[model samples]
Target: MQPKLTIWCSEKQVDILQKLGEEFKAKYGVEVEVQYVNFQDIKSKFLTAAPEGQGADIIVGAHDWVGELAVNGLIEPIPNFSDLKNFYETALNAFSYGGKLYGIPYAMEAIALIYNKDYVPEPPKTMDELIEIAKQIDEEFGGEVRGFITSAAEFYYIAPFIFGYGGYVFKQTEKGLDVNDIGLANEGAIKGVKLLKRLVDEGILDPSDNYQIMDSMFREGQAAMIINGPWAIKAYKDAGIDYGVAPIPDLEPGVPARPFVGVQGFMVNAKSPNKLLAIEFLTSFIAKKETMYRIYLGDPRLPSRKDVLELVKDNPDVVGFTLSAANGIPMPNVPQMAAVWAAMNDALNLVVNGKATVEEALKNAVERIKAQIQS
Candidate 1:
């Protein structure tokens, strides 16, 4: 009997998987089942079902999830592949935890500043100049276009600014990883917080609610410029909007802020009875250049394989995404990351909503992170 592979993934990704499955069935005479589930339910279900044979053979997930999954004995480490040379170094590094490779990366994503060319022909290079330009656009242009738009509720999106300003969640020292750097709550971090606060206070940002749907906001003209990723380009294209992407404006005069990058890849269940089959599918089918390239066509992210990246080079949007992610910091993949998220979210919301001062917010966040990292 031919080997059969099952995969569980978000509903948004089903179409591509289906097409790939058909190609695989034709080429290898194997059966591939693609199952779609709610993105919110994937983790809950996978954790409960993997050991019982009800879970998928292969999982598509983010790099940040590796630390938690690996520590919990949820995934199998991928063997070293000589063919792995095709992906970018950063993309590969994202999927590796504690020096063990666990996934076959398929897409690389990061954010950049999107601006309307008609309103401001010249984009600001520095954070200070960008704020001034945004203000000028509002003051001189009768408040028609705003300076910037970001989700205050999104810690991953905002963390890059913290690092750009010389404030980091952790510092590497002789003692493994140090998270007690109170400097994270210092002047530079305060400046970053103040920038977010200014946007909300100046009527430049919508304050009624946090985390509104940005695609609709941008499409409807509620925001003139936004900090978003390549995933949004197709939506804007369909809306007939004229825009250009550039490096995220810096926090200081010459320093550019780095955004946290999100990488997506395929992971195998360590306990699966069909572990060998699963690995074979990933290495021979899903990880192949043709299938990954097809997936990137719909998603428009940088491919994991170096060869596939060359294939995607003709795509201007993919090239733009590569440029934006060039300086990005790989998101921390430690299991303690869950704790960091809640703390960061609370602090960011407090500052952006004007409920707490920047100093207080940063102080609380730093303390919370220190406690969590140590625990």
Candidate 2:
């Protein structure tokens, strides 16, 4: 009997997996099977099933999954540097564990500053100018065009600005993952928080903690501008909204704001019977130039390969997103980051939705993260 290749993914993602898997079988003669479950339920199922020979050959997930999955021995370390060399450094770095590769990046993602060309043809060049323009648009349009709308509720999406201010959730050093330096309490971080708070407190922005709401508002032209990623491009296009993409406005006059770079890809199950075959399929077939182009074309995300970028250069929408994401920072992939949300969100929730001031909330956040790291 031919070796069976089973893959598990969320129901929403199964279409993509099925299409890609069919392409793989046609190209390489590999027999593949796909199983779909609820988005949030697949991971737990994988843990229970992998030990019983019911595990998948390849698992598609985010880079941040590395810290937890690797610690638990649920996934295998990527074995070949030569195979990894074909991807962008940023993509590879996101999926690395203790100097070893763990995943093959398929797409890179980041949010850019999106503005309406009708109101402001020339988008602001710096953070201050952006704010000023927003204020002007608000004042001129009688609240129809607000200064800005951000998905502040999505903390991960907003962390790049925190980093741009010289703050970070965890610091990396030669020793290993460093969690000692909590950037939430840094001066620049404090400033970023304060500005975000003022936007909410002053009624210049819609004070909702939901990103989908923000995306909808921006797409319908209900709001003047927002920060969004390529995943949202199709919606705006369908809405026929006239929008322009630009690099995130800098924090200082010349300091570029670094957004978090998100890379989604596939990891192999270490205990699977088809480990070597799965790795071969990933590095040789799925990670190839043609597949990367196909994925990016269908999804509108940046490709992980440098050569693949040239293929999409003439696409104005793709080129605009590429420019906006030029200064994105790779998110930290430390094991201790599991404690980040419970701790960090405690602080953010206090400020945004509670009575605590920005300083009080951030201070609490730093202390909480510090304790978690030490524990």
Candidate 3:
């Protein structure tokens, strides 16, 4: 039997990886096995299996898992990688922890303003303009359309506004994330939350419009615009609605809404006997120009490769997402980030539903995150 290399990826990526694996095997004479693993289960499965030498040789996953996986010695950094400038720095930075690159990033995604071409031909550039557009769209439609809806309950979707108003999850330092410096309750965060409440009070945004409702309204043409990411585009395309993507508008001049950019990439397992083979397969095949595009075709997200982005520059979807991610911040990869999600999400619900004031809600959130992470 020939030598074997094992890989794990999401079901959405299995077929593409399998096709690439065949090409790799034909050239290298090593049997490449790409298997489907549920996306949600991959990290926990890898964490449990890798230290025991039971994980796949390579795993395709999000960059946020890089730091923990590396510190725990479950994965190794990419060795002697060249052409560092080929990929977007934001994508590369997301995969870097402790000054070492732990993964080969293929895609990056951030939420953007997705608008209906028929209802909103152009998205605005400032908070005031955006609010005006939403109100105008609603009034013009005789109050029948849901204007400017979003999954407002999720901290993920609301973060652009938070950051646009000068707040952050954790203070980013050259060394790494300063996790102790929680910014959830900062004045800027309060300001951002007030903007959301203003929208709610003005009848332009419904706090109850969740991800499902927002997606459905946009696809069914009941919404003029909404905040969404690349993952939602496939369904929108299938629904055959002519939609346009734009960067999240700013709260003030030169203060654009900066969303969190999530990157998906390949990491080689440290304990795998085929570790070197996996790295070779990644650099020699997966990291190449056309292969990156092929991966983009398989999973519709903005390519990390600067050149691949140019190749697809003409595609309106890619162009919009690229612009949105260009100025976005990488999601914090610290282990403590888990606490922030739960705490901040609860704060969003409390503040938006009028259960708590923005100041009180965020103050409670930051304290909870601190308690949870510290414990």
Candidate with the greatest lDDT versus the true structure: 3
Q: What's the ranking of the predictions by TM-score, best on top?
A: 1, 3, 2
**Which sections of candidate 2 miss by over 4 Å?**
1-15, 25-57, 81-83, 118-120, 132-147, 172-177, 271-277
- Summarize candidate 3's per-residue lDDT along 1-375 as a digit string, tens digits: 688889999776887889999998898799999989987689889988987778999999888788778888888788766656688887887888888888889988999989998888778877788889899888888867876899888898888889888888989889767989988789989888888878888877777868889988899988888989887787687898899999988777878888888999999998898888888888878998899999888777888998997887788998898799887888887767767777888899987788999999999999999999889
Residue 188 CA displacement from its true place in model 3, Å: 0.3
The residue-by-residue lDDT of candidate 1 on 178-277, one tens digit each, is 5455455777667766777776787556554343455566665655677787767766767777777777877766667878788988889887877788
Task: Report the lDDT tens digits of candidate 2 across residue range 166-206.
Answer: 77766667986577766778877777777667666766554
- Whole-model Cα lDDT of every candidate shown, in order: 0.74, 0.74, 0.85
RMSD (Cα, Å) of candidate 1?
A: 3.3
Model 3: residues with Cα > 4 Å off, grouped in runs: 1-15, 25-41, 48-57, 81-85, 88-90, 132-145, 173-176, 220-222, 252-254, 271-274
Model 2 global lDDT (CA atoms, 0 to 1): 0.74
Number of backbone clashes in candidate 2? 0
What would you estimate as the lDDT of candidate 3?
0.85
Candidate 3 matches the true fold with a TM-score of 0.84
TM-score of each: 0.85, 0.84, 0.84
Say which prediction, candidate 1 or candidate 3, comes out ahead on TM-score.
Answer: 1
